[PDB]
């Protein structure tokens, strides 16, 4: 980056590495038709939403990093909490 | 608010699916 350089301290592999995680965090079981079904698309997609969102928090990498990570930490959480209520 | 926390319905998906 010449003069043109904001992404430059973070890398594609590293927002699609981290979004992919996201997901597998949500459901690591890699189902060939679930992966080719539109539910789990809109959860990819909302993936994505979560990776725009920290955007502007992120302008760190410490930061970045956290917030992702912060954030399925909670999720896994959740669903195992909720599911102790089952029956 | 872009949802940083997932909502019940999103999450129920995983709950409902057992391979």
Known sequence: ?87 | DAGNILPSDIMDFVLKNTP
Not at chain 1, 54 to 62: F, G, K, Q, T, V
């Open chain 1, 1 to 87: 980056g010449v003069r043109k350089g904001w992404h430059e301290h973070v890398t594609q592999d590293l927002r699609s590495h981290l979004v992919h995680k996201l997901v597998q965090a949500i459901f690591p079981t890699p189902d060939p038709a679930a992966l080719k079904d539109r539910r789990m698309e809109n959860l990819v997609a909302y993936a994505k939403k979560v990776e725009g969102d920290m955007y502007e928090s992120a302008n760190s990498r410490d930061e970045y990093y956290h917030l992702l990570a912060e954030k399925i930490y909670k999720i896994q959480k959740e669903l195992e909490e909720k599911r102790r209520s089952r029956l």
